[PDB]
Design an enzyme around this catalytic site. Structure first.
Site, short mmCIF file in Angstrom:
data_model
loop_
_atom_site.label_atom_id
_atom_site.label_comp_id
_atom_site.label_asym_id
_atom_site.label_seq_id
_atom_site.Cartn_x
_atom_site.Cartn_y
_atom_site.Cartn_z
N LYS A 297 0.98 -1.15 -0.10
CA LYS A 297 0.00 -0.04 -0.07
C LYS A 297 0.89 1.23 -0.09
O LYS A 297 0.55 2.10 -0.60
CB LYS A 297 -0.96 -0.01 1.19
CG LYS A 297 -1.98 -1.05 1.33
CD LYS A 297 -2.78 -0.75 2.36
CE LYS A 297 -2.18 -1.27 3.72
NZ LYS A 297 -1.57 -2.58 3.75
N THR A 298 2.04 1.42 1.00
CA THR A 298 2.73 2.47 0.98
C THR A 298 3.40 2.61 -0.51
O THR A 298 3.62 3.75 -0.96
CB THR A 298 3.78 2.34 2.26
OG1 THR A 298 2.91 2.39 3.25
CG2 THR A 298 4.77 3.60 1.97
N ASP B 154 -1.43 7.77 4.25
CA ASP B 154 -0.96 6.61 4.58
C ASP B 154 -1.50 6.02 5.97
O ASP B 154 -1.77 6.86 6.95
CB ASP B 154 0.39 6.46 4.61
CG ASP B 154 0.98 4.98 4.21
OD1 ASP B 154 0.05 3.93 4.39
OD2 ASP B 154 2.06 4.99 3.79
N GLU B 155 -1.76 4.79 6.29
CA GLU B 155 -2.19 4.41 7.62
C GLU B 155 -3.44 5.20 7.94
O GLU B 155 -3.75 5.52 9.11
CB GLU B 155 -1.24 4.44 8.55
CG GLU B 155 0.09 3.82 8.31
CD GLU B 155 0.07 2.37 8.47
OE1 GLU B 155 -0.88 1.77 9.19
OE2 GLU B 155 0.96 1.40 8.11
N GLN C 2 -5.61 -2.94 11.35
CA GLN C 2 -4.54 -2.59 11.86
C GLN C 2 -4.97 -1.23 12.66
O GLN C 2 -4.18 -0.24 12.77
CB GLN C 2 -3.40 -2.33 10.70
CG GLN C 2 -2.74 -3.42 10.24
CD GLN C 2 -1.57 -3.03 9.27
OE1 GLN C 2 -0.65 -2.72 9.93
NE2 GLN C 2 -1.66 -3.68 7.98
N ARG D 70 5.43 -7.31 11.14
CA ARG D 70 6.51 -6.68 10.88
C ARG D 70 7.89 -7.34 10.44
O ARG D 70 8.83 -6.79 9.79
CB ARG D 70 7.07 -6.11 12.32
CG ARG D 70 6.39 -4.66 12.61
CD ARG D 70 4.94 -4.56 11.88
NE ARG D 70 4.61 -3.64 11.08
CZ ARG D 70 3.77 -3.49 10.12
NH1 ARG D 70 3.02 -4.36 9.91
NH2 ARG D 70 3.90 -2.46 9.23
N1 LIG Z 1 5.18 -5.27 -6.47
C1 LIG Z 1 6.00 -5.30 -5.87
N2 LIG Z 1 7.20 -6.14 -5.84
C2 LIG Z 1 8.55 -6.55 -4.99
N3 LIG Z 1 8.29 -5.86 -3.86
C3 LIG Z 1 6.98 -5.21 -3.41
C4 LIG Z 1 6.08 -4.98 -4.29
N4 LIG Z 1 5.17 -4.10 -3.49
C5 LIG Z 1 5.51 -3.83 -2.45
N5 LIG Z 1 6.91 -4.55 -2.28
C6 LIG Z 1 7.94 -4.55 -1.08
O1 LIG Z 1 7.18 -5.23 -0.10
C7 LIG Z 1 7.32 -4.74 1.32
C8 LIG Z 1 6.20 -4.37 1.96
O2 LIG Z 1 5.08 -3.52 1.46
P1 LIG Z 1 4.46 -2.06 1.96
O3 LIG Z 1 4.48 -0.79 1.09
O4 LIG Z 1 5.62 -1.46 3.04
O5 LIG Z 1 3.19 -2.77 2.49
P2 LIG Z 1 1.94 -1.74 3.11
O6 LIG Z 1 2.12 -0.45 3.32
O7 LIG Z 1 0.80 -2.70 2.42
O8 LIG Z 1 1.93 -2.65 4.70
C9 LIG Z 1 8.19 -3.67 1.27
O9 LIG Z 1 9.67 -4.18 1.33
C10 LIG Z 1 8.09 -3.32 -0.38
O10 LIG Z 1 8.97 -2.51 -0.96
MG LIG Z 2 2.52 0.92 4.40
#
Ligand SMILES: Nc1ncnc2c1ncn2[C@@H]1O[C@H](COP(=O)(O)OP(=O)(O)O)[C@@H](O)[C@H]1O
Ligand SMILES: [Mg+2]
Ligand SMILES: Nc1ncnc2c1ncn2[C@@H]1O[C@H](COP(=O)(O)OP(=O)(O)O)[C@@H](O)[C@H]1O
Ligand SMILES: [Mg+2]
Lengths: 654, 652
Positions: free
Chosen positions: A35-36, A220-221, A251, A603
């Site tokens: 999502k981020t 975000d969040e 969450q 995490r």
């Molecule tokens: N399409 C993708 N391919 C490879 N890695 C990804 C992809 N999308 C997200 N990630 C990686 O996966 C991890 C978690 O995603 P993240 O943005 O932090 O999730 P959320 O915000 O939904 O909790 C991060 O290390 C991010 O860089």
């Molecule tokens: Mg996030």
DNA sequence: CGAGCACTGCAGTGCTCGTTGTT
DNA sequence: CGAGCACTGCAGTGCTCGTTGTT
């Protein structure tokens, strides 16, 4: 630029969100689904494809950690080349808006932020000054009451009691509290958000200016947003701004500060043409960690469920260690981290998470004894240390004599003949005359209303403050700070504080000079002193920030939301610690503790380790907590109990 | 020799001096040579009756009167006085109790309790008895207890309030005897009891002192009378001299009836009257007579003189106290400028507090002077403290000394700590040092307190042994330094701190000099108590003499100045509030007037400050009682105001 | 005017009782 | 369990209130 580099890694749902037409969108998905990632790339897409100006973009969220995460990723994708873009926390951006329009907000440009300790002390004074019994009307309870009101955008007038003694009196405390604050130029955390919202309600032109500028808003969040933050966002967007919110209702962990899960649905109901995109693939964790997270959250009722699956291998099992006590627990975690480090792992890739900030002390002691570097976030940090608070109060007085919080803290620190009796008079005069503590003093002195020694001692204090202001009136931040620390006498009393307590204490004062020395801030305009004081308040949970040195990351489960680490250690997995006793002493604040457990588990990227102590000493008594129910909720196949390597020492007969 | 002894005496003086050994009373007005007769009588007993100097005891009440006897004896017989006992009742009683402390039931080095100390202890005692200070004034207890001892009555005695005081008196004795403390009255009573309980002791003195002579007999209270009567028994021969017109100690038990009592009790007692005055001019003598004649019940007496009228009595109305003082210094300066000695000048007053403004004026005029009585050198705060450390070194049980310096300089032993030690002593039936010894040993005091209290007890012990092998002054200087007192008074606000540090210096010099049945330190301490009025030992230097009218009784001066002759001062308000107080005050004025040999001067101020407040007194009635032909008012204007004829007006 | 008292400031001490997170 | 005090004790300081004389 090349749209191509913006979509390469994205999967079906992520691309749909990133490469979508400008419109109100909700990206709803479980932890680690990107999502981020979607949010940051969306910003890049808005700038290259929709040719939106960096200046029309606002990326916001609640915690300093998550905001920092957005900012960091935004820097890596679009380069530090993002000028004009606002990225920060609701409190931070509110503060910013308030400094820039203080006059319309009815605030002095150099207003001071009131943190929790300061707010609690002011309340403890106001209540006593109102004759109210201490043990009868807890200042803590008054604080909760006042802050809860502000979380809902309610001022003293918006509300009236109907007899209800407790309600009507808390109402009076709130009135007096607001009066003291406005009169002293003080602003608490909740006030920042509320005042900022009122700003756009009372100043249509100011709002129009921002509705014209920030046409692209990203949160975000989102599930962290309370009612005043939701309103603020709604207002800013109006019917013209296009908003993207991303979040996960599983969450939601801030119900205690007004963030209700309904907010996600409210967005879908309130924003023009709002739609939903659900992500379903996790990229952060191993299947073992993800399977455990899923089974765990499944234990909560009332949730239309979510997919969340991964391609990854099962990975290592989740470790479960039953420690002898809290000391053994800390030593075990450190031992495990050493192994990771000895095999080439970075310390910064290890996070130690806990439910309450109080659990860090023992962990810290174990880390120190092992000469293992670490960084702790939240709780009692640098800027909340007695000696640092004292030092900043003098500077605060230099900036504004009306700072009642600063006045009270150091008027007689170090001791200078101004005892309780004299001060009781001053406080009484402030109460009756509706004036600031410094104001009251000015009069009591120009009316010879105080005893000889008194007025004389009080006069000297006021002269010492006026002196410091003139003497350092031009000095650069750090030297003015060095001066004040010495001339205030604080440096002196602390050196001779006796013991190792006074030593570390005097070092912190030295470290503060360095902080003001290395302090860096840029982009509208605010003096170094104010900007530093506001930073010490808004990003206090941060403390000193050496960020390049490899070190273990220590923080609460709350502050970790949004982050990820190869190795994760969650200590204190016991009924009464996590879930917290308060959540237990209630019947169903349990689903929220379970959502927090879900946050903790998700995490971990490679390895998750859970620990609990058979016994620990709390409040002078030994307790034998039951193991946390969350441990049993995990699938047995994902968990491997730790059995310490069997040994044998030299045979001792007899 | 004989001849010399009788040459100057008149018929009556000769009769008294050259009489066979027998109980005799010489009753006569002031200045008729009663003291001369007493002194020559001593010489006669030694030469004609061949009595040993060891058989003669000459005693009287005040230090001034005793010193006067001592001086004349020495001028008449020089050194032919060894073995002779000459002193005051308290002094001789004190010498007896030292030489027989065991039989008196007293420790070797008992400490004399003076007025201040007595009162303080009574304050501590009354409070400990949970009695309301305002309900039971310590001053009342003191008056009660001493008055009880003036009669020789012990806490036994035979009312509601009566029983309480009786109890306060009982606790007081127990407290004192326990600490080894003896108050002034205790000295007389204890000395007397010593003879009532130790027949062999009494016998020894009746065998030694067969010749007793008492001056100013009318000063004797009931305990002193008994004491004398008992010593003489039925074998000793006594001569008492006095004048009932000079009875001025009624407030301390001395009653006129005592003179008659002597004639009734002592075997063969006979009276001899003198009539001729050799001290004063006729003017002074006739004013004195007119003055005393205003008292009723007087049989007459009235002495005369062959002398000329001499200068009249000067009367000066000052505008305030300061002017009164400066006026007297002016008159004395003229006397000196014409060859007169300063010591031939005496400035008399009713109360000791009046010396202050006089002393101030004399200092400002650089005129040498010597004050007797009141707040003297050994009465000084700093001096008292220094002597308290010395007292605890001679006896830790000295509760008076203890509570005076226990926390002076402040050493952490606050009032709360002391209040515990007090109720400890009160119930444990022991002294303060005994209570501290226990409480500390049986750990009952907080760490902070207990560590300070003992810390103090440790200091005393150190000082005690550290200076046990050194000279008096060396021991004093040492104790003043190590006690901290020195350091304390040196920093004491520069509002008077210096003088106090200078007095302590003088204390050393005093101990450095100083003049054997007791140790040097115990002799010095007892002297500071019995002769406190004398202050620091006097040099030979010529100086103006200042003292109250009481202390002046027995003395004489070419020039006498009496200040404060104002209603409210003399006679004071208090003298108009009781029975025969007024007549006693008039007798005191008679004593004042009769001290003058050549010239008498009376002064009064139109205004003065009492206890801070400004007052306006009318001139003393005693002035109007003097014959107008004996007095010459000091002119405040040179001309005689022209008579103002009545102007017939109706205006308001 | 001068010796004790009432006050006030300050340091050392047992006693109480909160008791979850973030800005 | 330990911050936060409520208490207690010790001191320094500014102001109130009154006492004959002697040992
Ligand atoms: N399409 C993708 N391919 C490879 N890695 C990804 C992809 N999308 C997200 N990630 C990686 O996966 C991890 C978690 O995603 P993240 O943005 O932090 O999730 P959320 O915000 O939904 O909790 C991060 O290390 C991010 O860089
Ligand atoms: Mg996030
Ligand atoms: N017979 C005498 N001839 C000359 N002077 C005398 C005679 N008798 C006494 N005096 C002197 O007269 C003065 C007063 O006599 P004093 O003994 O002190 O009187 P009293 O004791 O009766 O008051 C003294 O100076 C004394 O020496
Ligand atoms: Mg005589």
């Amino acid at each position: 630029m090349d749209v191509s580099y913006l979509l390469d890694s994205l999967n079906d749902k992520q691309r749909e969100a990133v490469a979508a037409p400008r419109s109100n969108l909700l990206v709803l998905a479980g932890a680690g689904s990107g999502k981020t990632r979607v949010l940051v790339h969306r910003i890049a897409w808005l700038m290259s494809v929709e040719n939106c100006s960096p200046y029309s973009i606002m990326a916001v969220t609640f915690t300093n950690k998550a905001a920092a995460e957005m900012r960091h990723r935004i820097g890596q994708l679009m380069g530090t080349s993002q000028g004009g873009m606002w990225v920060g926390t609701f409190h931070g951006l509110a503060h910013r808006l308030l400094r820039a329009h203080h006059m319309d907000a009815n605030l002095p440009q150099d207003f001071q932020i009131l943190d929790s300790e300061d707010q609690l002390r002011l309340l403890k004074r106001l209540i006593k000054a109102m004759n109210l019994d201490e043990k009868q009307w807890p200042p803590r309870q008054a604080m909760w009451y006042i802050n809860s009101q502000k979380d809902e955008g309610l001022r003293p007038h918006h509300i009236q009691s109907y007899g209800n003694p407790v309600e009507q009196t808390w109402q009076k405390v709130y009135q007096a509290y607001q009066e003291a604050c406005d009169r002293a130029g003080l602003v608490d955390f909740a006030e920042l958000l509320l005042r900022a919202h009122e700003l756009w309600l009372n100043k249509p032109h100011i709002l129009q200016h921002y509705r014209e500028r920030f046409t692209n808003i990203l949160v975000d969040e989102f599930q962290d947003t309370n009612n005043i933050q939701y309103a603020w966002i709604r207002l800013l967007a109006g019917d013209t701004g296009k908003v993207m919110i991303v979040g996960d209702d599983d969450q939601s962990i801030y119900g205690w500060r007004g963030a209700q899960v309904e907010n996600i649905q409210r967005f879908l109901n309130d924003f023009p043409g709002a739609e939903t995109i659900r992500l379903e693939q996790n990229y952060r964790s191993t299947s073992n960690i993800l399977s455990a997270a899923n089974a765990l959250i499944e234990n909560n009722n009332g949730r239309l469920g979510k997919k969340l699956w991964t391609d990854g291998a099962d990975g290592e099992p989740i470790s479960l260690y039953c420690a002898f006590n809290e000391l053994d627990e800390a030593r075990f975690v450190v031992n495990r981290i050493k192994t990771w480090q000895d095999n080439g792992g970075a310390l910064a890739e290890c996070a130690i998470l806990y439910r309450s900030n109080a659990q860090s002390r023992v962990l810290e002691e174990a880390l120190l004894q092992a000469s293992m570097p670490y960084r702790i976030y939240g709780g009692m940090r640098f800027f909340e240390r007695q000696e640092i608070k004292d030092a900043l109060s003098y500077l605060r007085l230099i900036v504004n004599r009306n700072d009642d919080a600063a006045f009270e803290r150091v008027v007689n620190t170090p001791t200078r003949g101004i005892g309780d009796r004299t001060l009781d008079v001053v406080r009484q005069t402030s109460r009756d005359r509706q004036l600031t503590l410094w104001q009251a003093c000015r009069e009591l002195l120009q009316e010879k209303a105080l005893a000889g020694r008194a007025a004389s001692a009080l006069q000297r204090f006021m002269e010492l403050i006026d002196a410091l202001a003139q003497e350092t009136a031009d000095m650069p931040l750090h030297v003015q700070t060095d001066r004040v620390i010495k001339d205030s006498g604080l440096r002196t009393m602390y050196e001779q504080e006796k013991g190792e307590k006074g030593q570390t204490r005097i070092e912190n004062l030295e470290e503060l000079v360095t902080a003001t020395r290395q302090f860096s801030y840029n982009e509208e305009d605010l003096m170094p002193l104010q900007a530093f004081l506001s930073h010490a308040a808004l990003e206090a949970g941060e403390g000193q920030a050496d960020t390049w040195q490899d070190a273990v990351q220590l923080m609460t489960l709350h502050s970790a939301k949004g982050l990820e680490f190869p190795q994760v250690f969650i200590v204190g997995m016991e009924e009464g610690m996590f879930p917290s006793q308060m959540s237990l002493d209630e019947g169903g604040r349990l689903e929220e503790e379970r959502r927090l457990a879900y946050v903790g588990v998700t995490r971990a990227m490679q390895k998750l380790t859970l620990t609990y102590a058979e016994t620990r000493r709390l409040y002078g008594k030994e307790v034998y907590h039951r193991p946390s129910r969350f441990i049993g909720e995990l699938p047995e196949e994902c968990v491997e109990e730790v059995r310490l390597r069997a040994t044998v020492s030299r045979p001792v007969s007899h």
